[PDB]
């Protein structure tokens, strides 16, 4: 009777998740990609048009990953030669196709390995930094103009990230910010002169004879880091003078004093920028408003325009101090930070005055401030019935704080209880996207009176596929532990019958503001777990986790590797005692911190745990980056913090691994967590003389995501679980 | 009744052979080193005499682990605080300790970080390289001579080899010859200036925070190789301001003329000096006899003095050419070279005779030429009985080679049929080492007329240990194939009863000139698998084994890949028709080119093997050494020999090991076997989607042999081998 959800179906995708990515240019319009051909829709009927045939580029002899439309709709970026670098950065080849003439541009095109280009915000001039340095052209088809002449690989950086920044502060590859009508073209810099390279083997294609060192700037904790610049540069200028002029924004004394980070940058206005300064202790930040003087031709920063912005009980922000949310004039701005309670909520600023007020406020968090109009501020939050792991839309009422409404709350409550948003230029309309616990589903409204004007994706298809597998279901609740509740999931195999004992894996992760239960509806190798396998797989988030205040959230401060490891141990006990946990087949495993969680625990010599596997984990602390690792941890000197950075390692326990079943997995070109953190894991094992599994993935990196690799290694574990499961 | 051998018995080294290490000091005496102090012993009547106390060099503060006594017994090296670099080469402290006033030398000593170090052979003279250059000391505390001042890391290098050099060429890591009088000195030089890098990670103590990039010059196959060049110095003409002259003996022309290498240095006399060189396409070497002109202060090399070895089958010698033997008068020498039934024995040259005469015949083959006096010349063969794998010493008069005799052969036929020898100064005395197949047993000979003086050490106290233990038995026979017989090998389980049937692991290595078929007796990991898993650990020496003719051992000359592999899975055929074999449990296992054969025979599709073990496996030929894959492939161009290069990768079959059961092992700082060479067979399997066993060994190089790894990875294999049988 129906088959279950198989391993393959996993591996192959057989049963695929509908998406709806459209694409807003305008607060009436968006395009969406359809494989095909683009078409551009209106949102206010729903009638749309063809915006570029499939065949417009068949002839072209490359194949195209990507384009970009110029805001004023007269040119179309071509990306192509697409070369993945880390998780953000990459490098492409680029042609502009002229949308009125219906021509590709032939002179002057972007360079071959461009490593970023973005229009600017309207019109159509275009910035790209190619070999470090930054560029721009004021028309598509006119010679660029040279902005920075100090790029350097692995040594100076105009305009777009080094490794840490990329990975840790920005979440992305661009360090260039354009000015909201295209004038200014603001950027950073980075010296990684004194900043260590981490070198490991890269194997390549069976044809190279000898293998390739890679080397990259990264700093580990404590290591000398890299320094930052901020420049604005008037683009405006570039016809009357030769070597346009960078003006210099430089610090706030207060950041000067030592190490520290620019940790975000966002226009106010036409000329007006806002910068947040964050030290390399991370409990404090500074942001600088900084207004352009005509006179002058200088930007100047007011201090008493400055906002402090510091923690005492963790570091500044969840992974980094918020950003600002500009009104109009750009006189004031909105912004989520943690109240007197330890709670995230939205507070309210004026530039020249000091304190802020809180607009919202109560025991759950704002997640994002998302839409913001002379009449409201649009945000999501886990406020709806109490649940951290609920997402949904609100509206509060700027003229009284008292007129809040939830739009996404109601729709579905059964279907949708975690939602995302995509606002139109204006905020006229926007694209609700649930993600669970039910199908996805994509629906769009008008902001006038809210109105949900249809339905754009509801996986249908996908839904009369599934009723014809035995699917697993999914529990959300929770614990209570010293009078504090802490939630966790299941995936419970079909047909779960609590009166019989089934074997339980813990899938953990558990690192800071990590959040592991929630309501989002997943096909994942879990799901194939509980299916086929019969198997529960349970996720905790404990002290560390994120999104319920900062009681919980910073209850880890300058001690990774205790209470979250703790309290994942502490969960199965529980579990265990709830009746239909099998006691003696009790599994964790991990990735990436989450690896690392899963070592610590097996390594723990608390006898709950079978078996366990560990992908590309942290080993100690001392290897990993620093921004990401000091934000916790503070510096490894017996002066602050080494003595913690010591005790934390997963090579100290590696005596206790002998009562245990262990897989150890990474991959050799991992340029995050290096391979590295792994070699010590075994090697110490070894010393102590424990037997355990291993399986290292040649050139996959931390995502081991290669379509070959990614297969192979969710099979090998699958091997592994059973096996240690006593069954197929 | 009895336990068995255990896998901890094997890796705790519970049973333990007894050897005796002598050290020839005269023609008369020998040293050994006895763990406290090392004694002189009378080879005549067997007494002995302390010749240094435990105690003499306690409050020295460092561990001392070797030493060296100059020719004229009047000083001691000390070496300390050894650092391994490679499979010879390591660097070492150094102090020198004058034995007549009893005094450690304090003054001009030896630098620290010495890479090599050679007494003169008489005398007290001294020769080391320190930075890459030599240095020459006439007197252990007076100041060094500097030889060269071209030393420079990774790049030139005098007086000791490249890597390449020392694995492959030489087997050590010394490139210095001193004439017989120690009056010259000469040396080669080593010049890896365009010889690419291998380069890979070495992640150290925990404590290191990044982990640092070991590179070493290592020719590819077909890659630059380094140069070299060979000298000559003369160490009486001292000076205090005077760089000795160092006079070059450049090449025959036959190989200046293209890439050659430098593969033998042998002194003649105190004033002719014989170099062998090999071209790079290793089927032509030349011999070179030069005399150092009194009047011209040249070393000068006549051409009608020079001799040729070629191969039209495959290459010259069994690794290399052989090295010669010279008379007292350095006018004639004795040498083993492939005869015309392709039969390596020794030829008698005259130094300006083009041909040479045979003065050994035979369906067998001499393996090495052990000592030369007026009246006879010693050797080890495998005649005895016609078994390749069996090793005795035989002399022949030089004046009627119809007087052959052996002289170990008949000592007991029943426990020793595998020798080696040490003779004294003059060949006086010999010292016999039978190592099977029974417990080894050292004796000592009196050369006049083949007494037998003594037993020096029989091992009986191993042997009353393993009366009590269930030990297996040994079983060395052959097959048939194609009108040619070949040895196999098998360890029997104890009772063996071959009414059942038996799980059936092949042991490989089958490299050419490899042999793991013969009669040493040993305890290792097949011992435990046979004694205490009841599992038959099984050999064979196929196409390309040696010590058997040219015409197996070159069967496989620009053929790697194809009939070695093919042999061993044709053994486990008939293995497995001979009755006592469990057909559905057969594996295979083997390390480094063994490890090359396992992964080819795995991924041959041939359905004979259920699972396999490779350590350390060579994956594609393009990956490992010029000086031994060239050998035996040609270069890997599209004129020569590319095709195969490419046809004999294991990646090419990675698709058929969906059938097998495989474990890859390697370690990641294999300077020898890259652990790219692993890594590229892993991604192949990957990408066709094929499930497999892995553990690379964190810092380990080809040995993997550190005293935690060795042990985990045997109980790893163990684990998967148990696994695999049930
Ligand atoms: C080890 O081997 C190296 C490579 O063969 C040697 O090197 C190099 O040195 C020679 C010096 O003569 C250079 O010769 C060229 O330059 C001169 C003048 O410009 C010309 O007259 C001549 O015709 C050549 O064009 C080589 O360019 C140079 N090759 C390199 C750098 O690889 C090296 O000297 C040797 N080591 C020792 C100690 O001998
Ligand atoms: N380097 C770390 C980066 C990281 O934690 N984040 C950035 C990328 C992915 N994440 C996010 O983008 C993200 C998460 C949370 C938020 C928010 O609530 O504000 C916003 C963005 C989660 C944080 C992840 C990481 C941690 C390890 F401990 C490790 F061993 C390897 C890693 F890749
Ligand atoms: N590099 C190779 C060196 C080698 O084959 N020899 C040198 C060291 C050990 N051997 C010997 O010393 C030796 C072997 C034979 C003789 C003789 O009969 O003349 C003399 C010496 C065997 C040959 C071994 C090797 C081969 C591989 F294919 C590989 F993957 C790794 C290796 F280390
Ligand atoms: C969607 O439909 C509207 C309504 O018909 C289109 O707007 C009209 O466009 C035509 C031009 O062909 C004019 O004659 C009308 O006066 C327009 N009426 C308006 C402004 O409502 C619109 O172009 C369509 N949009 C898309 C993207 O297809
Ligand atoms: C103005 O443009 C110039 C010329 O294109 C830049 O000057 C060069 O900058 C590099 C440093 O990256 C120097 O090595 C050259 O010597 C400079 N030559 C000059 C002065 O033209 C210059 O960087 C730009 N202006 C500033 C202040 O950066
Ligand atoms: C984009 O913003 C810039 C900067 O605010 C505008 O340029 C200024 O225009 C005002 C006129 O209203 C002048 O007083 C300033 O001298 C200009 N500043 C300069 C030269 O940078 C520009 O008008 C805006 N673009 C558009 C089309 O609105
Ligand atoms: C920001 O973090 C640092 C480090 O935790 C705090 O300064 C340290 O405070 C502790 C007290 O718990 C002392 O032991 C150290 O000597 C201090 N080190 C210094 C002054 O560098 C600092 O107070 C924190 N700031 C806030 C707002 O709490
Ligand atoms: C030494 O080996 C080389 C390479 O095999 C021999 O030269 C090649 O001989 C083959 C014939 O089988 C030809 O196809 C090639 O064109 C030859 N290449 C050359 C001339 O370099 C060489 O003859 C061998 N020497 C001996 C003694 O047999
Ligand atoms: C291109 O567009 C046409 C027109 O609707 C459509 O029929 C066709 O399927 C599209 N081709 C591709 C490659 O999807
Ligand atoms: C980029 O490289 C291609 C070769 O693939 C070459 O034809 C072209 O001229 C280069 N320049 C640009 C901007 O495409
Ligand atoms: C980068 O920093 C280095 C090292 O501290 C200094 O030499 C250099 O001037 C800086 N580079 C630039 C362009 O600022
Ligand atoms: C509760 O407090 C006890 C007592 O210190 C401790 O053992 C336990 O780990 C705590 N659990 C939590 C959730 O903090
Ligand atoms: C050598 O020194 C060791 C060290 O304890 C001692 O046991 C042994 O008896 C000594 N042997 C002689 C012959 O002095
Ligand atoms: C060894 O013993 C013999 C026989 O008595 C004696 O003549 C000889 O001198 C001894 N060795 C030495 C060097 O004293
Ligand atoms: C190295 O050896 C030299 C030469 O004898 C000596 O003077 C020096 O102290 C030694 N170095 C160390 C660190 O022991
Ligand atoms: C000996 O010759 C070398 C090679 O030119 C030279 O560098 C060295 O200085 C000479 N010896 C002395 C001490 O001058
Ligand atoms: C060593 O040989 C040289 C050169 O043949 C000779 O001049 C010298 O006398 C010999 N040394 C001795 C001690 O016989
Ligand atoms: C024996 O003959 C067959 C057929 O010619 C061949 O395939 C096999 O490889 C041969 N074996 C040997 C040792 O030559």
């Not at 100076?156 to 360090?175: K, L, M, P, Q």
């Not at 918020?322 to 600023?349: A, Q, V």
């Amino acid at each position: 009777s129906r088959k279950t959800y198989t391993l393959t179906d996993y591996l192959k995708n057989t049963y695929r998740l509908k998406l709806y990515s459209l694409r807003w240019i305008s607060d009436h319009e968006y395009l969406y990609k359809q494989e095909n051909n683009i078409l551009v829709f209106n949102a206010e009927y729903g009638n749309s048009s063809v915006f570029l045939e499939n065949s417009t580029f068949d002839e072209f002899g490359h194949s195209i990953n990507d384009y970009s439309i110029s805001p004023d709709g007269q040119f179309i970026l071509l990306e192509y030669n697409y070369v993945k670098q880390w998780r953000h950065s990459y490098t492409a080849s680029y042609d502009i196709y002229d949308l009125n003439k219906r021509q590709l541009i032939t002179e002057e095109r972007i360079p071959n390995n461009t490593q970023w280009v973005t229009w600017s915000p309207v019109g159509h001039k275009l910035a790209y930094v190619w070999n470090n340095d930054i560029y721009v052209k004021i028309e598509p088809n006119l010679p660029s103009y040279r902005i920075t002449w100090t790029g350097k690989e692995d040594i100076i950086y105009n305009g777009i990230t080094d490794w840490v920044y990329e990975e840790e502060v920005f979440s992305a590859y661009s360090a260039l910010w354009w000015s909201p009508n295209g004038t200014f073209l603001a950027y950073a810099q980075f010296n990684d002169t004194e900043v260590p390279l981490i070198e490991y083997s890269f194997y390549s294609d069976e044809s190279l004879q000898y293998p390739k060192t890679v080397r990259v700037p990264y700093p580990k904790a404590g290591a000398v880091n890299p320094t930052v610049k901020f420049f604005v540069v008037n683009t405006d200028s570039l016809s009357s003078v030769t070597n346009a002029t960078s003006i210099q924004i430089t610090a706030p004394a207060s950041m000067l004093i030592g190490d520290h980070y620019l940790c975000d940058v966002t226009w106010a206005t036409q000329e007006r920028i806002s910068l947040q300064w964050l030290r390399r202790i991370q409990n404090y930040s500074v942001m600088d408003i900084c207004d352009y003087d005509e006179s002058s031709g200088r930007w100047n920063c007011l201090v008493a325009r400055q906002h402090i912005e510091m923690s005492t009980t963790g570091w500044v922000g969840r992974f980094r101090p918020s950003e600002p949310h500009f009104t109009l004039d750009g006189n004031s701005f909105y912004k989520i930070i943690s109240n007197e309670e330890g709670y995230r909520h939205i507070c309210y600023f004026q530039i020249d005055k000091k304190d802020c007020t809180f607009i919202t406020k109560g025991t759950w968090e704002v997640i994002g401030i998302e839409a913001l109009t002379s009449d409201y501020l649009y945000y999501i939050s886990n406020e709806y019935k109490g649940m951290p792991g609920g997402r949904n839309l609100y509206k509060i009422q700027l003229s009284d704080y008292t007129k809040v409404t939830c739009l996404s709350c109601e729709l579905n409550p059964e279907r949708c209880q975690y939602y995302s948003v995509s606002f139109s230029k204006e905020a006229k309309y926007y694209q609700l996207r649930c993600s669970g616990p039910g199908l996805p589903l994509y629906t769009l409204h008008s902001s006038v009176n809210d109105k949900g004007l249809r339905v754009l994706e509801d996986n249908s298809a996908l839904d009369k596929m599934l009723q014809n597998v035995q699917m697993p279901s999914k529990k959300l609740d929770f614990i209570i532990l010293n009078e504090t509740k802490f939630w966790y999931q299941m995936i419970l195999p079909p047909h779960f019958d609590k009166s019989k004992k089934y074997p339980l894996l813990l899938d953990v992760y558990a690192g800071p503001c990590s959040q592991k239960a929630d309501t989002v509806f997943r096909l994942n190798w879990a799901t194939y777990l509980a299916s086929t396998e019969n198997i529960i797989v349970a996720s905790f988030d404990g002290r560390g986790s994120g999104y319920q205040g900062d009681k919980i959230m910073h209850a880890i401060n300058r001690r990774l590797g205790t209470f979250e490891v703790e309290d994942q141990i502490e969960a199965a006990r529980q579990f265990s005692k709830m009746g239909f946990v099998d006691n003696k087949r009790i599994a964790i495993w991990g990735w990436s911190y989450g690896g690392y969680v899963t070592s610590m625990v097996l390594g723990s010599g608390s006898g709950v745990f079978k078996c366990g596997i560990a992908v590309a984990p942290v080993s100690r602390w001392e290897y990993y980056d620093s921004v990401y690792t000091e934000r916790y941890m503070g510096l490894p000197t017996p002066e602050d913090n080494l003595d913690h950075y010591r005790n934390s390692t997963v090579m100290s326990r590696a005596e206790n691994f002998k009562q245990v079943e262990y897989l150890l997995i990474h991959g050799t070109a991992d340029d995050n967590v290096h391979f590295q953190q792994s070699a010590q894991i075994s090697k110490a094992l070894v010393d102590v003389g424990v037997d355990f599994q291993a399986m290292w993935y040649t050139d996959e990196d931390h995502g081991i995501a290669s379509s070959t690799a990614h297969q192979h290694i969710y099979t090998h574990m699958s091997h592994f679980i059973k096996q240690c499961f006593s069954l197929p």
